[PDB]
C-alpha cells in the first residue's frame, strides 16, 4: 500500500483505490495503474521534473529503502495478476529489486523529489508507475 500526497491530491495504484477515492475522483488511467483523488488537507510530497534514471524506493516487504537504476518510462508487456490480465502497461520503469504484490504504493524518489510508485514486479524485478509527466499535480 501507499500514496503520494501532493497539494490537494492523493496518487494511488488504481487497483488499490478505495470507495472514497472513486467518490472524490480527479483522474484515472487503467493502462498506467494510476488514480488521483482530491484531499481536504494539503500534502508534503514534491514531484520530480527530470529524466533521472537513479533513485531510491521503499520496499514494505523488507522495511527497507533500496537505491536503484531504472529504465525510462516505456510500454512493457506485464504478466497477469489478480488485478489485471497480461497486457501493455504504459509509462512503466523497470529496476532490479525485491517486490511482492503488497509493495505496490511504495515511493520511488530522486534528488529532485517523487518519481513514481511501485506497481509491478517478480523474479527480482520491480516496476514503477511514473508521475513526472503529470504537470497538473503541481497546480489548482
Ligand atoms: C510489486 N509487485 N506488484 C505485483 C502485482 O501483482 N501487481 C498488481 C497489479 F498492479 F495489479 C498488476 C500489475 C501488472 C500486471 C498485473 N497486475 C507483484 C507480483 C509479484 C511480485 C511483486 C509484485
Ligand atoms: Zn530527478
Catalytic residues: 15, 33, 104
Residues 6+ apart with CB under 8 A from 113: 45, 46, 47, 48, 49
String of DSSP letters for 12-70:
EEGGG--HHHHHTEEEEEGGGTEEEEE-SSPP---B--S---EEEEEETTTTEEEEEEB
CA distance 33 to 91: 9
Way it was determined: X-ray
Which stretch of DSSP H or E encloses residue 73? Answer: none
What's the CA angle centered on 137, arms 74 and 5, to 5 degrees?
Answer: 100
Minimum CA distance residue for ligand 1 atom 7: 120
The protein residue whose alpha carbon is closest to atom 18 in ligand 1 is 101
- Is 103 near ligand 1, meaning CB less than 6 Å away? yes
Verify whether ligand 1 is closer than 6 Å to residue 21 (CB atom): no
| Backbone phi, psi, residue 58, to 5° | -95, 130
| CA 51–ligand 2 middle distance (angstroms) | 6
Contacts 24+ apart (CB under 8 A), 28-35: 29/90, 30/84, 31/87, 31/88, 31/89, 31/90, 32/89, 32/90, 32/91, 32/92, 32/129, 33/84, 33/89, 33/119, 33/120, 33/129, 34/91, 34/129, 34/131, 35/11
Check if 88 has its Cβ closer than 6 Å to any atom of ligand 1.
no
Long-range contacts at 79-88 (CB < 8 A, ≥ 24 apart): 79/122, 83/15, 84/15, 84/30, 84/33, 87/31, 88/31
Q: What 3-state DSSP class applies to 104?
A: coil
Experimental structure resolution, Å: 1.3
**Dist. CA 29 → ligand 2 center (Å):** 23
d(CA 137, CA 84): 26
What are the residue ranges spanned by the domains of the chain?
Answer: 3-44, 45-140
Q: Which residues are bridge partners to 78 per DSSP?
A: 87
Q: State in Å: Cα 77 to ligand 1 middle.
A: 12
Closest CA to 140 of 32, 63, 26, 53: 26
**What is the spatial distance between Cα 33 and Cα 123, in angstroms, rounded to a whole number?**
20
Amino acid at each position: 500500500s501507499g500514496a503520494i500526497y501532493v497539494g490537494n491530491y492523493r496518487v494511488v495504484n488504481r487497483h488499490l483505490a478505495t470507495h472514497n477515492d472513486w467518490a472524490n475522483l480527479v483522474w484515472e488511467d487503467s493502462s498506467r495503474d494510476l488514480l488521483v483523488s482530491s484531499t481536504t488537507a494539503q500534502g508534503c510530497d514534491t514531484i520530480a521534473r527530470c529524466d533521472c534514471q537513479t533513485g531510491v524506493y521503499y520496499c514494505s516487504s523488507r522495511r527497507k529503502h533500496y537505491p536503484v537504476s531504472f529504465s525510462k518510462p516505456s510500454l512493457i508487456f506485464v504478466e497477469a495478476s489478480e488485478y489485471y490480465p497480461a497486457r501493455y502497461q504504459s509509462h512503466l520503469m523497470l529496476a532490479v529489486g525485491h517486490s511482492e504484490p503488497g509493495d505496490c504504493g511504495g515511493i520511488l524518489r530522486c534528488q529532485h523529489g517523487v518519481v513514481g510508485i511501485v506497481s509491478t514486479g517478480g523474479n527480482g524485478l520491480v516496476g514503477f508507475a511514473d508521475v513526472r509527466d503529470l504537470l497538473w499535480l503541481d497546480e489548482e
